[PDB]
Structure formats: structure tokens, C-alpha cells
Design a protein around this ligand. Structure first.
Ligand SMILES: Cc1ncc(Cc2csc(CCOP(=O)(O)OP(=O)(O)O)c2C)c(N)n1
Ligand SMILES: Cc1ncc(Cc2csc(CCOP(=O)(O)OP(=O)(O)O)c2C)c(N)n1
Ligand SMILES: Cc1ncc(Cc2csc(CCOP(=O)(O)OP(=O)(O)O)c2C)c(N)n1
Ligand SMILES: O=C(O)C(=O)Cc1ccccc1
Ligand SMILES: O=C(O)C(=O)Cc1ccccc1
Ligand SMILES: O=C(O)C(=O)Cc1ccccc1
Ligand SMILES: O=C(O)C(=O)Cc1ccccc1
Ligand SMILES: O=C(O)C(=O)Cc1ccccc1
Ligand SMILES: O=C(O)C(=O)Cc1ccccc1
Ligand SMILES: [Mg+2]
Ligand SMILES: [Mg+2]
Ligand SMILES: [Mg+2]
Lengths: 529, 531, 529
């Protein structure tokens, strides 16, 4: 036997969790107390719950494991609905742990601070944005519930929800067992793999298109081998940008329809054997298509199913399929913008892409990139990376900075490059004030165009997309980092070199960008939509 | 523009409805008044709501069309839940029409007679046993709703629910248009047909097994042609007994595993190309198997889907698949000898009697059977089709079904087989024959017992029933009854029943307790294994 | 420990159940086996499930206790929805026990005979017509579930639902404990009783109107004492006809608005202190009011609440209130149609009322009366009785005959008088064929007018209300009873005398009644509606 809170933390750690992010409240104090005193999982606090969710999500994307977000009842949990809905959409297994009233509280005739219409209102809301839930209000059942919920998060790669009455944190329970098993029919898998391979082999111009699930289930290496053995080109989706960064043979590029490279777009759209491997069928990934794409003519492996030839194979895990394909195969690109003119001219999005890329070509091992939504994301699309995480489908802003924070918190010393615009920084960039206590020194390039540019690009006439010029670099000092505003390419270049040479605190390079000055990609992308 | 009730009755007739069965109640009197006056559909009344449902259901089964059951709010509707769940389970499109309180009633601080906990309670209940429902409380929208709902009933071949406030019965509305269109992807259909056909051709011993949907969608003639072009034997499921009764080449037989003909069973379970066409995967159809059949290795077309090779093709209508297959293909013993002596009557003697008449020239009658040894015996009868609750297995279906079918059979007589247990539930409906202008022949297997249950658990006393003199009670209901105890009397009684028209003919056959068809005996043991 | 089925039967018996009615099916065989071999509760089978429900309901109304109805999965249970919905409406605590597939059945890839869309479909349907439900699929929990469900049936006086997987019938469990307790605030009760008494004392013409709950909770004797101590007249509702039959001072009559006695109607409608004690606020009870009745000006005690003076007292049990009123009070009629002319003239409804009433006045102790819906009920309204049960609010037909059967099954030798019309007899009158095996000999007076008269009375023009003339008396013999058709008052009188003098089998007096010939009450009642 052991305390329930302790059994839970150990169960998470046993399943790969590397840390726990959170913000306490009276309902969660007992649980945080156990998390801090046991130190089973490193405890990192943030300033506002959205960042807690985003960071757990990034830690999960970074290591392809479970992310852990702990909050208090109501004020905490409801403040994380947006980040969780986003993790659900982009299939990131974030474990939401919320404190709640004790099992005997609420029967005094009084309404309790933080509750919704009913004490169960919060549970009801999270049912909508998670794949499994459990209220750990029965010691006898807790272990099975925990294994069931965490088991679901790992299999479905989506968020789960655990509610812990505060009087149960220290209740004695048996250790948590293994995840329930999800049966897989060997004959179905065999047949599916046989039909998929045959479809790829009969195609004249086959294309392997990789997306999120490839990372979620840790299949990047195996999938590079599959492309290798099949002898076909690999292209990522917009959502899947950054996949196979460590592959001996990198993908040919990223498919962005009318907004991406013309040859990749033609290769993808004219393919008679397009294998959408673990892809989200989103507008962001396919609405930008120049020529209407017939999804029914593709091979689609997603959500533990495989569809092709107008029919679906149920209960087929991506990992199982990849292994099955490999077993049947015997052993055995778009240019990056470069050459930045570090002079006295104004900074444009692509100049930032060039600066980054030039240091790498010059010898700097690339950095994993965390990106927020805005032109910063369409610009990162042309950056050299060691992986990339961004809200490519949910597209909610605020992800960038806390994602870089969460990822670096578990990166074992490797720095994370963060790209975010002024609108997004206003929302959550402030979380950087926590870098000192957390012990990380991310490099953040803030695209300051004093505007919600993407929206102006969408509806140029409106005035509400105008924003003041916040002196983000001047405020960096107050949050404990080094901030520098840059207006010229030479200042940009120099600032970037200083940032990389300076560790110990966050480096905010505030890049002044004129309104109307965008990356090549964004413009066309918007019009495509 | 026209009255809602009238627009509904026309929409029902436009879709093949042939009659409306029902029992009235104050909340429905208006609706019934219109029906009676407009005569858009013959209005047949019965004694108890369960029969209303079964008859409407039998009528839909007989003509492969919609069935219409009209009842009153609460006391009427709720009393039909069992028949509707059964029609749902057995894919019969029964259209339930219920009278309801006026759109303004129930706002005087008072509860209304017949209502459930809430006025919407009945609606919530029916959502569980219907594929679509609609409360016709908006004249502007009634037409389109009638269309959506009746269309779902037709496409999915299951029951639907229509709730009519009594102050809406005579409300002006536009006429009802066509059902919405469920467009089928031609490319998917093509891929599906090609794969199914390839599988059938690569099999060395293919078998086409037909079940309910074949009749529901009126595909019997096309399936018989399909089998011919494919050159494959046709077998029915237990539920499908009676299918292709009027085909040039009838099915080889009916599969019932350990309880059926050993040859048919062998053919079915050894097949490397078992095509389950419109089949319900029920314990009644397959838990009888000699050896567990691996259903994932069959070709299964059911509920607008087609599964084979461990994958499924969604949105593929059974009729669409049959036609697709036919476009890819170029054209190309019953028990007898009743010994009419003084020996007691056993179930099989009854099949022999029925079959000898057919062999001597009698055109076979369609059979309506209830659940009990009557059904298992009917498995051995020559028929012009047969309807029974072979999956839901709910008793009481027998007599009402026979009645419902004969009401729409344009003169053809229906033979009904039923046990004493089931007759006690709905056999009494025969008292409506005169008024309905029908005279069905009813063979009542009377063993003073719930014999099928005794077979499951012989040690129990509660299966011993009293002896009711059903034949003696026939007269009071307007029919001719005769109780038979010997095989000779059985034979005489049957000839007289066929020779006598104008009144329903009831032949009450006394079967000794503990005497049951081998089929029933083996079926029960077969099912027991599943516990 | 003991077998679950056995624990359940004992729990029912401990709570007053006197019998179990049912029809088996393979899913329920194991349970019926236990019921028959243990004989904890006498087992009575019927022919069709509707009668099972109606009979359980009557047994419950008869002894003011729990009624027990046992059926098989699907074909059995769904066939009882109407009788159960009726018991729910008229507040009769019928315990529905249904057999179901074993906990491990249904996982073989096969659909199971009797199931609805899903295995849980039946459970879902019964939730709509019961106050509590439980699937006894966990031996550990079974005892608590049983006590919770049966506890709810007794407190709320409505049907409950128990589903028993067949593989659980013989599972070992601990004996069932007591019902969970439903707290009652002493101060609230005290205040409520004080305000009610004061309202009755300040009224100039107070009227105590009794309805169903008075019988359901066994308050007839105590309520007669209350009227006695308060010094006020007692009138029943239409639904409550038959209440206080054993009261030293019988009620003044039954309130049926424009369809009842004029003086009772005036007394009720002009009352400044109308106490609706345990009444159903139905159209059948109040829509017949001559003068619109302001329910808000009344005192209403129903469903564990009391409303008066535009306000409601929650959680006030009727029994508690009656006891409270009694504690604050120190110690201390409409004529019956009679004189039947037993001559050669045709039989009319009221003649039947007179025949019955004359035997009683002549010395025959009245019989409890079971009535179906139709003119038979409006006629029984003018009969002398030892109590009366009828679907006075739900108004569903088919209740009559099986109700008389169920009641007599638990009447300990007392005969039950049943009144039913031809339409209703066609539905369930056939259940009489079971009287011999069950050992009862009810007297049944069938009003044969070859018609659904009530409906013709409602819409005279229609032809579909015409019915053939079934020779019910001629068919009685086949069901093992004595049947006699009567056309003249002299035949009626004589038939009734023969019936009472003949015990050993059911006596069916088929009274031929001309169409259009009704009781006085029905005509006006219909027009009132
Ligand atoms: C939580 C949330 N609220 C609003 C929006 C809607 C939006 C999509 S893009 C954008 C403008 C972003 O301006 P930014 O300075 O960050 O970068 P840039 O456009 O290149 O100038 C907004 C407000 C989203 N996606 N999420
Ligand atoms: C509405 C309903 N309630 C109970 C049952 C359960 C049952 C299945 S079989 C059977 C006995 C039938 O006796 P019967 O005399 O009719 O025929 P036979 O067995 O050959 O003697 C019962 C009670 C079903 N299926 N449906
Ligand atoms: C289950 C159910 N279905 C229909 C109805 C609707 C109805 C209310 S009254 C009546 C006619 C009854 O004729 P009966 O011969 O029984 O007695 P009488 O009218 O005096 O001639 C019907 C059909 C109800 N209430 N319940
Ligand atoms: O601890 C919290 O989350 C709070 O909001 C503080 C608090 C605690 C109890 C009542 C009101 C506020
Ligand atoms: O999740 C994303 O946003 C991705 O693009 C996938 C990914 C995540 C982390 C490193 C590389 C790719
Ligand atoms: O018409 C019906 O369905 C009835 O049950 C008759 C009725 C109508 C109004 C109140 C009570 C009974
Ligand atoms: O619906 C049934 O019970 C069947 O067995 C199908 C059927 C119905 C009518 C005639 C032939 C087959
Ligand atoms: O026992 C019952 O309730 C039945 O309906 C009999 C039965 C049992 C198993 C399959 C089909 C019918
Ligand atoms: O429940 C009813 O129908 C009543 O009228 C109440 C009643 C029941 C049994 C005996 C006396 C009164
Ligand atoms: Mg901006
Ligand atoms: Mg029998
Ligand atoms: Mg009548």
C-alpha cells in the first residue's frame, strides 16, 4: 500500500512522464505537497494555467510520452480548457490532474468557491475534451481507474482527466498496475498490410506523407526505414512539419498546397499512391490544395484505423501497421532560404529565416523549434530545425512561449528556439519570467509588427487589427532575461549571435517588422483558405 | 394544401402502404375520424395493441413495404413497445402513429391521463426502438418531417415514430414530397462488388446464404438470379426460412447447425466462400453451428454495409450490391406420408399432414408462426413463404401476423401455427376475423405446456399449464373449432378447414407433454452451449 | 452468505411482499427455479405479461405493500411497459425483476435473442417508467443496490427496476440490509403542520379530500381519525374512489365535478379550506370541475411535499404530516342507487349497480372491487364496496381482470368483484383461464354492449367503435369457469345470486347492454372533458 497521490505520480513516471507542471489552489495543496516532498516527478510551476497546459503538451510532444498538468478545482481547471482542447485536437496525451472538494464537503448547505453550477459541472466540461476520465474518490477502485485512464491516454494519444478529492490525496491504495490491453487481430493486420503494400507497389508515383501520429507513437526512425525500403519520397503535412529531422534521408519537404513549393505540391497532388501516414484531415493540411484532392483515393492511417479502396480496417494501430509493413520489405528536396545580407536595411520575416539557417549552415547544430500561431509559424516553415512543435491544426495562439519553456524543462540542457508574434507574446510570452526559477534559457525571437498581421492579411480594410508598439525588449529585464530590439538585418544577425553565445537567462530578440511585410508562405496560405 | 392527417395517409399510400391497423383513444379519435372518412387506407381495428403492432408488422413483411399502426397516447402506444422492438430487431418498417395531447393542453396545472412522468416521456421511450421520430406540431414543417421519417423507415427498413397532437390532425399543410436522397458512392460500390465477386470466384465451395434483408428490400427474384449466374447453392438462415419460395430453383435448405439437416450444415460450415446476404448475426442463426463459424472469414452484407477480408465498405445498400453483382455476371425432401390412424399426434405428423395436401395439388399457403415448437415444426413445412420472430423470438406474433397478412393478401389464405402458451396471449384476436372479412387457417399445437421452456429446464413445475378448450371457444369468436387427438382426426380436420371458407378455421391439435420435434430438442441443446 | 436470487426474495418478503407474479423465459429460468424451489414468495404465473404487471400492481394496492412482477429479458419486460407506466402514474410500488444475459454473454460477436438495439436498451427504457434501477451484476454491491432500490419504491410508492444477469442468480452475497433512511426535518414538519391546521381552523367550510397516497402509505384509519378530530367532511377524488371504506364515518362521497353529485360538487368547489390529501392533480380528478378550481388556493400534500399559501414545504412525508396533525388535535352522504326491478326489461348500467347494492343491503358483506376502464368504472362509482381499484388516472384498459386476479391471489379467501366491458375483456379477460391453477374464484360482471362505448360517447358519428357480439359466457367454460349471459333484469338478479352461491371457479356474468345505454355519470363526464 501507499498514498494515492504517491501511487499516481509513480504510475505516471513508470509510463515515461518526465515532469509535472502546475499552479496550486487550496483544493490541490495536499496533492502539490506530496508532489514536492516526494519529488517523484520534477515539479515546475508557471504563472497562468494556460501555460501549464501548453507546457505539459510540449513536454509530451518533445519526448513522445505523457505530459502532466496539475491545477486546482474550477479557477484552475476551467482556465486550461483551451490548451487541453488543443492537445486533444493535435493528439498530445496531457494528463490533467485537478484538485477537488473532499468527498464529504459540499453537504453543509453551502456552495463552494470555484464550483460551477453543480460540483460535477467541471467533470462534465472535461468529458468533452478528453478521451477518459475518473474521479478518484474510492481508494479500492483508484488503482484500476488510474491504469484505465492513463492506458487510454497512451493508446489514443489524447488528453485524459483525473479529479482528486482533497481528502483522498493521502488515502492508502495498492500500487497501480499495467494498462488494460487493447487486442489486435493478427489476421486483420496481416491483410491490411498486404493490401497497403500492394497499393504502394502498383502506384507509379507513390508518396509517403507523414503527420502527427508518427511522432506521437515514436515511429520517426521506423518510418524513415519504411520510406527507405519502399524506395519512395517522404513529404510532411503542414501539421507534421519538423518530422524525421534526424532521418539519414530527410523528407523532400512540407506540403502546403498553393502556399508551398510547386514541385512538392505537384508531386503530392498528382500521386497515384498517396499514403497519408497518421495524418489529421484538417483544412490547414488540405484546404490549401491547388487541385481538389480526393481523399478516398488515398491510403489513410489514423486513429487506430486504416482506410483505402473505399473501405476501412478497424482496430489497426499505426505502430502495428508500420512494423507489419517493415516485416514484408527487405532492407534498402526543397532548398532552405539562406545568405542573409547583414546590412542596414529593414528586417523582413525571411531575413529571420536566413539568419537562423545561416548559423546552422555555419556549424551550429539546429535547435528544436517551438512556434506560436501567426506569421512566425509560416516563417518557421522555412527554417532548419531539430524538430518543430506548433498548433498546426488547432491554431490557438499562446502556445509558443510556454511550449518552448516546457520542452526545454525536459530537454536536458538543449536550448529551444521560440518564435512568436507580438499578439501572441501579449497573451503568454510573460511566462518567460519563470525561466530563472525553472533553470532554462530559451532563445526567443519575437516578431514585432505591432499588429495581428495574419488577420489584417485576411481582411485588410479593418482597423481593429492595429496594435500599439509594446517595448518587449525593454520589459525583458523585469522578467529576468536579456532583451534587445533590432530594426536592421545587421542588428538582427548580431543579436542572434549574442543570444547563442549567452546562456544563463532567456534571450529575447525583438525583431521590428513593418506592417504588410510577411513571409512568402502566409500570403498565399490565407488566400488559399 | 390539405389536412395533415390526410397528407400523411397519402404519403403512406404513395409509398406502398396498403392498410392502417389500430385501436382508437380520445387523443387519436380525430386522426381516426379522418382515416375512416377519407378512406385513403383501409382502417382495420383489432382487440389489443400488441396485435396492432404485429399485424402492421406482418403486413409490411408480406408486401415488402411500410406497415401502419395507429394507437392512442400512453395506454395505446406503450402497450405496443414489445411488438415495435421486435419489428426493429427483425428489420420491418412499421410506422407508429400516436395521437397526442393538443399543443396547448397540459398548461392548466394538471396532469393528463395516459401521460408518463412527463408529456415527452413516451417520445423518449420510442427513440429507443425506432430509427427516426417526429412530433408533428408545426404544420409548416410537417410535410418535410413526414418525408424524412418515412424515408428513414424505408431506407433502414426499421420502425419509425410519428406523434400527432390532436389539434394538428386537421391542420392545413402542403403535400408531402419524396424521401430525401441517400446518394451512394458509385466508385465504392464498384470496388465492393469487384472484391465480393472475386472472393466468390476464388472459393472452391461458395455458398450464398440469404436472410431478412433480401425480402425487406424485395430482392428475392434478383438474388435467385444472382445465385443462378454465380452457379452457387442458396441456403437460408433460420430467420430467413421461407425466402425465395417462388424462385425457379428454391434454396437447398435452411441452416440450423446441430438442429438442421446434416448435409446443409456440412455445406455451410465447410464453405470457404460463405456469403451472408442481408443476414442478422444472431445466436438463433449461428449459435446452433456444429463448430463455431469464424464470421470474420465470411462476406457479410447487412445494414447498408459490406464486410469481408477484415474490412468494411460503408454506405452500400444491399439492393445496390445485388444489382452491381448482376451487372458483372452474364446470364447463365420434405417430410410426408401422414399415417391417418389412431396413434397420437407428434409435431412432425402435423408437417406431414400439411405437406401431403400440397403434394396432392394444393397451392402452398404462406405461413405465419409464433415462437415455440410450432416454429421449429414449420421449418419442415412446404410454404409460400413464412414469417416468424426468428431473432427477437417474442411470443404472440403468430395469430396477429396471420391476420395482418391475410388482410392485405388480396384473397390468398394464410396458415398460422401457434402453441397454447402463445395463443393465450394473442390468439383471441381471431374474434376480429368476421369484421375483417378474412378466414385464416390456424393450427394450434396444444400441449398444456410452455414446452420449449420445459426443454431448457425439465425439473420445473411452472411449465405445466392447464388444458384450455380452445376449439370449444372458437364459436364464441365467430369461427369453427375442432379438437383433434389422433392422426386420423388431424387429417380430416385439415381437409375440412381447407374446404371451409368464410370463417377462420381453428384446428386444436393435442400434442402430449414431453413430445417435441427433434429440431427443437437439438436447437435448445445447441443454444445451451452458449451459456 | 446466500444466493443472490434467494437474498432478493427474502428482502422483498421482509418488506411485505406477499407474492410474485411472472412469466419465465430462458434468461429468467434460473431465477424462477430459485423462486419455485425456495417458495419464499408464492409464485403465480399468468398468460401474458401485461397481466403480470397489472396483477403485481393490484397485489400492491390491495395490501399497501410491494408488488412483485418477474419477467424474461426483452419479450417479457417490454411487454410490461404499459402496466408499469400505469403503476408509476398511480403510484403503486411494483418491483420489476427481469432476467438478462449473463455478464460474459454478448461478447461472442453475436446479437442475442430479445435484445434491443443494444443490450442496455431495455435498462434505458425502464429508467423512464421507474424511480430507481439496478443491474445486479456485482455480488459485492448487490445487497446495497437491492436495499437502495426497494427502499426507493417504498418511500416514493412507485415502480422500481432490477435486472439480473442469469449467471448471477446463484452468486453468493451477504443478506440485504435495511432501506437507506430519508431524513425528515422535525422543525419543518412542525411548522408545516402548524400552518395547515391553522388554515383548516380559519376556514368556514373546510373539506378534506382524500386520494391515492392515503392508501399507498396505509393512512386510511389515521386519516378518518383526523377528519373526526378536525370535525370536517371527507370527500374522495375520482382516483381515490373506494378509500376509507372501513371508516366508522364514511366519506360524504366522491367528487366528480359536473359528473358527480351536485351537493358534493358544490361543497368541494365552494370550500375556503380544501385540503387535497395525497391527490393526483389529474384531468380525471379536476378537469370535470364545473367552476374553474384555483389549485393555488388549496392545501396540497403529495410526493413528499406540502403546498399552500403559494409556498411549498419540501421533504414532508404524508405519513409524517398526518401524525403531526393528529398530535396537535385532541380526540373527537350521497345515497346509493338501490331497489332493482328484477323483471323482464332490458339491462342498463345502473341496474347492475342496483343488483350489487341490493345484495349488500340484504346482508352480503361488500366485496373489494376491481374495475377496468370504460363505463364499467363510472358504474362502479355507484356501487357499495370494500375498497376499489381502477386505473383512475392512467386510464389504460386491461387492468380490470388481472387486477381482480392479483388481489384475490393475496386476499386470503375473500372474493373480488370484477367489472369490465367487452373491449377490455378482449384484451386481458382471458387471464381468467388461470383461476383454476391459481385457486381463486372471482365474480366477474362483463358489460357486453358490443362496443367501445366510451369512445362512441366521445364521437358518436364514427363507425370504427362498432364491435361484434362475442359470446363471452359461451367461452367461459373453455377457460374453466361458469359463464352466463343475461339480457333481463330478472336474469341479471338471478345470475348474481347464483354467482355468489357458487365457489370453486370463476363466475362470469355477461350482461347484455344495448348500445347508447350508459350510466348517468359517464355521459356528463365525457362532456366535461
Ligand atoms: C487564442 C486565440 N485568439 C485569437 C486567435 C485569432 C488569430 C489568428 S492569427 C492572429 C494575429 C496574431 O498576431 P501576432 O502578433 O501574434 O503574429 P502575426 O499575425 O504574424 O502579426 C489572431 C488574433 C487565435 N488563433 N487564438
Ligand atoms: C412475450 C414472451 N414471453 C415469454 C417468452 C418465453 C418463452 C419462450 S418459449 C415459451 C413457451 C411457449 O409455450 P407454447 O405453448 O406457446 O409453445 P410450446 O413451447 O411448443 O409449448 C416461453 C414462455 C417469450 N419468448 N415471449
Ligand atoms: C390499452 C388502451 N387502449 C385504448 C384505450 C382507449 C379507450 C378508452 S375507452 C375504450 C372503449 C372501451 O370499451 P369497453 O367494452 O371496454 O367498455 P365501454 O366503453 O363502457 O363499452 C377505449 C378503446 C385505453 N384507455 N387503453
Ligand atoms: O485556494 C484557493 O484556490 C482560493 O481561491 C482561496 C480561497 C479559499 C477558500 C475560500 C475562498 C478563497
Ligand atoms: O506536434 C507537432 O506540432 C509536430 O509538428 C510534430 C513534432 C513534434 C516535436 C518534434 C518534431 C515534430
Ligand atoms: O379516450 C381515452 O383514451 C380514455 O381513456 C377515456 C378518458 C378520457 C379522458 C379522461 C379519462 C378517460
Ligand atoms: O420475416 C420473416 O419472418 C421471414 O422469414 C422472411 C419472409 C417473410 C415472408 C415470406 C417469406 C420470407
Ligand atoms: O426462452 C426464451 O425466452 C426464448 O425465446 C427461447 C429461445 C432461446 C434461445 C434462442 C431463441 C429462442
Ligand atoms: O388505487 C386505486 O385505484 C384506489 O382507488 C385506492 C384504493 C385501492 C384499494 C382499496 C381501496 C382504495
Ligand atoms: Mg503581429
Ligand atoms: Mg405449448
Ligand atoms: Mg363496451
Amino acid at each position: 500500500h501507499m498514498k494515492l497521490a504517491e501511487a499516481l505520480l509513480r504510475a505516471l513516471k513508470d509510463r515515461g512522464a518526465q515532469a509535472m507542471f502546475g499552479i496550486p489552489g487550496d483544493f490541490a495543496l495536499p496533492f502539490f505537497k506530496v508532489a514536492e516532498e516526494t519529488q517523484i516527478l520534477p515539479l515546475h510551476t508557471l504563472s497562468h494555467e494556460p501555460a501549464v497546459g501548453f507546457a505539459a503538451d510540449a513536454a509530451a510532444r518533445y519526448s513522445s510520452t505523457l505530459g502532466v498538468a496539475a491545477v486546482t478545482y474550477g479557477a484552475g481547471a476551467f482556465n486550461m480548457v483551451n490548451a487541453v482542447a488543443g492537445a486533444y485536437a493535435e493528439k498530445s496525451p496531457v494528463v490533467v490532474i485537478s484538485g477537488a472538494p473532499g468527498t464529504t464537503e459540499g453537504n453543509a448547505g453551502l456552495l463552494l468557491h470555484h464550483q460551477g453550477r453543480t460540483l460535477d459541472t467541471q467533470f462534465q466540461v472535461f468529458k468533452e475534451i478528453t478521451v477518459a476520465q475518473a474521479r478518484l474518490d474510492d481508494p479500492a477502485k483508484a488503482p484500476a481507474e488510474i491504469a484505465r485512464v492513463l492506458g487510454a491516454a497512451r493508446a489514443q494519444s489524447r488528453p485524459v482527466y483525473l479529479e482528486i478529492p482533497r481528502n483522498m490525496v493521502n488515502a492508502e491504495v495498492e500500487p497501480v498496475g499495467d494498462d488494460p490491453a487493447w487486442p489486435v487481430d493478427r489476421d486483420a493486420l496481416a491483410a491490411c498490410a498486404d493490401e497497403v503494400l500492394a497499393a504502394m507497389r502498383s502506384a507509379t508515383s507513390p508518396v509517403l506523407m507523414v503527420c502527427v501520429e508518427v511522432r506521437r507513437y515514436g515511429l520517426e526512425a521506423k518510418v524513415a526505414e519504411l520510406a527507405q525500403r519502399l524506395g519512395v519520397p517522404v513529404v510532411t503535412t503542414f501539421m507534421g512539419r519538423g518530422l524525421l529531422a534526424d532521418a539519414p534521408t530527410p523528407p523532400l519537404g512540407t506540403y502546403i498546397g498553393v502556399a508551398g513549393d510547386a514541385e512538392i505540391t505537384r508531386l503530392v497532388e498528382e500521386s497515384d499512391g498517396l499514403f497519408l501516414l497518421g495524418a489529421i484531415l484538417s483544412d490547414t493540411n488540405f484546404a490549401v490544395s491547388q487541385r481538389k484532392i480526393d481523399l478516398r483515393k488515398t491510403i489513410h492511417a489514423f486513429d487506430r484505423a486504416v482506410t483505402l479502396g473505399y473501405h476501412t480496417y478497424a482496430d489497426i494501430p499505426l505502430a502495428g501497421l508500420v512494423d507489419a509493413l517493415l516485416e514484408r520489405l527487405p532492407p534498402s528536396p526543397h532548398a532552405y532560404p539562406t545568405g542573409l545580407q547583414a546590412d542596414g536595411e529593414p528586417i523582413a520575416p525571411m531575413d529571420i529565416a536566413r539568419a537562423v539557417n545561416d548559423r546552422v549552415r555555419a556549424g551550429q547544430e539546429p535547435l528544436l523549434i517551438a512556434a506560436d500561431m501567426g506569421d512566425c509559424l509560416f516563417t518557421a516553415m522555412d527554417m532548419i530545425d531539430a524538430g518543430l512543435m506548433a498548433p498546426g491544426y488547432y491554431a490557438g495562439m499562446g502556445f509558443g512561449v510556454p511550449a518552448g519553456i516546457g520542452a526545454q524543462c525536459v530537454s536536458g540542457g538543449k536550448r529551444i528556439l521560440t518564435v512568436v508574434g507580438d499578439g501572441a507574446f501579449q497573451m503568454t510570452g510573460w511566462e518567460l519570467g519563470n525561466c530563472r526559477r525553472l533553470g532554462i534559457d530559451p532563445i526567443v525571437i519575437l516578431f514585432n509588427n505591432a499588429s495581428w498581421e495574419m488577420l489584417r492579411t485576411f481582411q485588410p480594410e479593418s482597423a481593429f487589427n492595429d496594435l500599439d508598439d509594446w517595448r518587449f525588449a525593454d520589459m525583458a529585464a523585469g522578467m529576468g532575461g536579456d532583451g534587445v530590439r533590432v530594426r536592421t538585418r545587421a542588428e538582427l544577425k548580431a543579436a542572434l549571435d549574442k543570444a547563442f553565445a549567452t546562456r544563463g537567462r532567456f534571450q529575447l530578440i525583438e525583431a521590428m517588422i513593418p506592417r504588410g511585410v510577411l513571409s512568402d508562405t502566409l500570403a498565399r496560405f490565407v488566400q488559399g483558405q
